[PDB]
Design a binder for this molecule. Structure first.
Ligand SMILES: COC(=O)Cc1cc(Oc2ccccc2OCCn2ccc(=O)[nH]c2=O)c(C)c2cc(C#N)ccc12
Lengths: 401, 547
């Protein structure tokens, strides 16, 4: 009910990001939504004296046919002054189950600083640039802006105070427009508790991190090895020697002495079996000197394995994986690689939000034009991470398979 | 007097930290001074400008060419940034046919919209005195000056705010704004249409805006931004390829301008060679002799541009189709239509700058471009007709290491077809010879060796001059492909070669890679295995090629 002064970083102007083209149905949905919001004072039309712009598009979240308005506040977020912080709940990832709630509506009841509103300007585009685009700016806290959870933090604390005092065993976290609630109850008791918290928030996504673990490097167990089998084993071991110090491959390479056919079976000498066993024992241990640095960026690499299978690694230093995983879920994307990749990016970003409380920078195995043409068609989250595009096929694809 | 409704002013500031312009007035002839005094006198009598005292410290130079020409370049440098709404003109192919279309040009466009009073002091300009024996006559603008940075944007936004209720209460007509002209279109009867045009002229007159009292001097066909707009069709303004004894750089850039512009409706326009002659020239007067490829391409262009071709307007009730054809050398051409032989528009796509490529990637990129253009123009993705079998695309995207996707499409058998030229095996081949390859080179003398040793005792080492490590690894694989049967396993330690071949190109810059591709196409089964170098892997003989 009282506006808090908000400014930008020193020496940085407002965001001036080009609005990309939208389909007719998305434009109509944004016109209807923005008309309804304008009738409610959440946004207001602006004149040509506002040179700033932030992209806007429309999505349809899970289990809903109603269109939702999504604003790509990435530039405004990186240009907005740093708000200060709450230490990340290191026990949120430890809890057995976590449920994600959309608390974006609660942001619209708090007015936005008057002098900052011109920086939230967005444009509903028109087909074929026939008529001018409909320009709006926000009067309240917008969804997607990083200052909205920072300003609403006090109000959220006051609303969640009785529930947190009532259940000290329930962990509550907040990131952007999302509220992550972790506990160890039963799925039914968890759903009833979530309905309790949602009506508690009213009068004012099953996720199980315990069923997630870090993945080790595994080697084949064979009774008969071919030349090709041993060659691949030596390649994977030489790759793993960049991560684990004690990996030794000379006794296995000793078997490849001589030009033999790739399909020829080779028996393992005793020294080779001993070497392979030592390498297994070394791989069973965790990585030496792997820590998290909050001042550094998180990097996520994704490899396409085929048959709807995808592998990923979150790290900060090369060969120092903080997390590794294998997303193979099939949900109406069997014939679309881009939809699979987008759901993978969303899931990995959610895991990163749970573990560290921030999103990683992705390295996507896709061409820039394809991804930038189709990724908004399958996006269902309220945040957007940063990404880059790898155009050279990495050799380490099958070593994560 | 009927009360004219006021137009809300747009608050305007200068850039942060900057001040208004202060430029010295130029000395003018007595004739020019008299002319400017008369013009400014009439304008003051109309209310566009006003006399100001000596307190105003800002000044902008003025000229007479009589007509007054105020040079606002300094104030434009010092004026804030505006939201320019004119970025990318509407494409004629996106318009929808209307039974009646009327044009209304607004007289005194900028000189009818008021300027922010707190900003008028920055528009000050002085008229010099005769012999400069008196202080010059000082004026400031009360309306949007023609040539000022914020005149088009403020004019457009004010006109939009005025036209909003009329467009709301008249959904059966469409209105379009462009500079000082409005285009209204409707499917009503000509009487009802002219009636609603009269209502629009009245509604604009309620704000003090004058429309053509005469019949509008613009009638079909309309010549607009290089386009011809007709009642039932559209095209480009006539494209004439001239006959030249010798072609210079400016003639070739004119030719590629006319061809690039004409390619959006004339199908099959190619510009690869004519624009290839401009590679790294940077000299406007340099005469470049035309290659025979460019002359034959120009002959095909003259054959396509022989007789006029037109495009139709958009019908939202019919499906939107886009058909693609390969033209060779990285050139692609596409037609977008809704009925056969009646194109909405056409275009082309040239491959990006790359060292390796294949046809499936280029076709994908072209599909993405066409998709973006269609969403811009029509607001929807068209259904595609592509020269590629369904099974080819399925093998490609299922085996490609990258994620890739094409929207809804169907196969059209219009050669040349896009195909996969080779597929590498997933597992080693039983009964096929195993070639262990390697290559090495000396960094100083540029001398190297490339060769292989096989499980059957076959060997080869070839010496090479003026080579590198990468060249000798590729050359080693090439030798293994040369001297092996229809099925072959190949073992290499070159991460470079594996990085090239796993990208699956069918055409490359390096003639060595192209030869490798030509060898792969002839094979039945090829399995390419990689091992680490210098790890004592027998068979992989690094010392055999370092002698
Ligand atoms: C922003 O406006 C545009 O760019 C589109 C635009 C639309 C326009 O006309 C229209 C106005 C409103 C709705 C549809 C319109 O064109 C439909 C297709 N068409 C076109 C011409 C014709 O006879 N008969 C037709 O059925 C006109 C007459 C324009 C005239 C000029 C000129 N000089 C420039 C642009 C124009």
């Amino acid at each position: 009910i009282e506006t808090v002064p908000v400014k930008l970083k020193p020496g940085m102007d407002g965001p001036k990001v080009k609005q990309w083209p939208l389909t007719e149905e998305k434009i109509k949905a944004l016109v209807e939504i923005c008309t309804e919001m304008e009738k409610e004072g959440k946004i207001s039309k602006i004149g040509p004296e506002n040179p700033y712009n932030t992209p806007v598009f429309a999505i349809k979240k899970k289990d809903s046919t109603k269109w939702r308005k999504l604003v790509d506040f990435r530039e405004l977020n990186k240009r907005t002054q740093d708000f200060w912080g709450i230490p990340h709940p290191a026990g949120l990832k430890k809890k057995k189950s976590v449920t994600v709630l959309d608390v974006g509506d609660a942001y619209f009841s708090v007015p936005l600083d008057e002098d900052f509103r011109k920086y939230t300007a967005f444009t509903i585009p028109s087909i074929n640039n026939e008529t001018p685009g409909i320009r709006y700016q926000y009067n309240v806290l917008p969804q997607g802006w990083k200052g909205s959870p920072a300003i609403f933090q006090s109000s959220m604390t006051k609303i969640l105070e009785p529930f947190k005092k009532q259940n000290p065993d329930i962990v509550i976290y907040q990131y952007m427009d999302d509220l992550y609630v972790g506990s160890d109850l039963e799925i039914g008791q968890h759903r009833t508790k979530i309905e309790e918290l949602r009506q508690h928030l009213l009068r004012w996504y099953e996720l199980h991190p315990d069923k997630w673990t870090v993945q080790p490097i595994v080697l084949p167990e064979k009774d008969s090895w071919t030349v090709n089998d041993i060659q691949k084993l030596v390649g994977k071991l030489n790759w793993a020697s960049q991560i684990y110090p004690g990996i030794k491959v000379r006794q296995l390479s000793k078997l490849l002495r001589g030009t033999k056919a790739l399909t020829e079976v080779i028996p393992l000498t005793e020294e080779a079996e001993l070497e392979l066993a030592e390498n297994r024992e070394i791989l069973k241990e965790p990585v030496h000197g792997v820590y998290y640095d909050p001042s550094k960026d998180l990097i996520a690499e994704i490899q396409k394995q085929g048959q709807g299978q995808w592998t990923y690694q979150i790290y900060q230093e090369p060969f120092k994986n903080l997390k590794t995983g294998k997303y193979a879920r099939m949900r109406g994307a069997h014939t679309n690689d881009v939809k699979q990749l987008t759901e993978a990016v969303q899931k990995i970003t959610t895991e990163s939000i749970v573990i560290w409380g921030k999103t990683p920078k992705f390295k996507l195995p896709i061409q820039k034009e394809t991804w930038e043409t189709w990724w908004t068609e399958y996006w269902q989250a309220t945040w957007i991470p940063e990404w880059e595009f790898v155009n050279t096929p990495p050799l380490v694809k099958l070593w994560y398979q | 007097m009927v009360p004219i409704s006021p137009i809300e002013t747009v608050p305007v500031k200068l850039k942060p930290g900057m001040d208004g312009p202060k430029v010295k007035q130029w000395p003018l002839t007595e004739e020019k001074i008299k002319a400017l005094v008369e013009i400014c006198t009439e304008m003051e009598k109309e209310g566009k400008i006003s006399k100001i005292g000596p307190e105003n410290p800002y000044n902008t130079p003025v000229f007479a060419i009589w007509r007054k020409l105020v040079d606002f370049r300094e104030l434009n440098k010092r004026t804030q940034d505006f939201w320019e709404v004119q970025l990318g003109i509407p494409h004629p192919a996106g318009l929808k046919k209307k039974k009646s279309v009327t044009v209304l040009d607004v007289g005194d466009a900028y000189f009818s919209v008021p300027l922010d009073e707190d900003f008028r002091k920055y528009t000050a300009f002085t008229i010099p005195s005769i012999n400069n024996e008196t202080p010059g006559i000082r004026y400031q603008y009360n309306v949007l000056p023609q040539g000022w940075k914020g005149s088009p944007a403020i004019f457009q936004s004010s006109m939009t705010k005025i036209l909003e209720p009329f467009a709301a209460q008249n959904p059966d007509i469409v209105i379009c704004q462009y500079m000082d002209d409005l285009y209204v279109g409707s499917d009503l009867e000509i009487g009802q249409h002219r009636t609603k045009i009269e209502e629009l002229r009245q509604h604009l007159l309620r704000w003090g805006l004058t429309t053509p009292d005469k019949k509008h001097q613009k009638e079909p066909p309309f010549l607009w931004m290089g386009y011809e707009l007709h009642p039932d069709k559209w095209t480009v303004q006539p494209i004439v390829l001239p006959e030249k004894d010798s072609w210079t750089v400016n003639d070739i850039q004119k030719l590629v301008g006319k061809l690039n512009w004409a390619s959006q409706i004339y199908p099959g326009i190619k510009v690869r060679q004519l624009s290839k002659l401009l590679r790294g020239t940077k000299a406007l007067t340099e005469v470049i002799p035309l290659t025979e490829e460019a002359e034959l391409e120009l002959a095909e262009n003259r054959e396509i541009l022989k007789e006029p071709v037109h495009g139709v307007y958009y019908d939202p009730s019919k499906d939107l189709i886009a058909e693609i054809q390969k033209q060779g050398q990285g050139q692609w051409t596409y037609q977008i239509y809704q009925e056969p032989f009646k194109n909405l528009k056409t275009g082309k796509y040239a491959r990006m700058r790359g060292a390796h490529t294949n046809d499936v990637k280029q076709l994908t990129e072209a599909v993405q471009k066409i998709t973006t253009e269609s969403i811009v123009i029509w607001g929807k993705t068209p259904k595609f007709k592509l020269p590629i079998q369904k099974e080819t695309w399925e093998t490609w995207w299922t085996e490609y290491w990258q994620a890739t996707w094409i929207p809804e499409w169907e196969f059209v058998n219009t050669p040349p077809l896009v195909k996969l030229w080779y597929q590498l095996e997933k597992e080693p081949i039983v009964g096929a010879e195993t070639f262990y390859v390697d290559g090495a080179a000396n960094r100083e003398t540029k001398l190297g060796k490339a060769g292989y040793v096989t499980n059957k005792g076959r060997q080869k080492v070839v010496p090479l001059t003026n080579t590198t490590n990468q060249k000798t690894e590729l050359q080693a694989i090439y030798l293994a492909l040369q001297d092996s049967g229809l099925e072959v396993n190949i073992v290499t330690d070159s991460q470079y070669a594996l990085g090239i071949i796993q990208a699956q190109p069918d055409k490359s810059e390096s003639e060595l890679v192209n030869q490798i591709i030509e060898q792969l196409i002839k094979k039945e089964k090829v399995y390419l295995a990689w091992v680490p170098a210098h790890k004592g892997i027998g068979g992989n003989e690094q010392v055999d090629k370092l002698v």
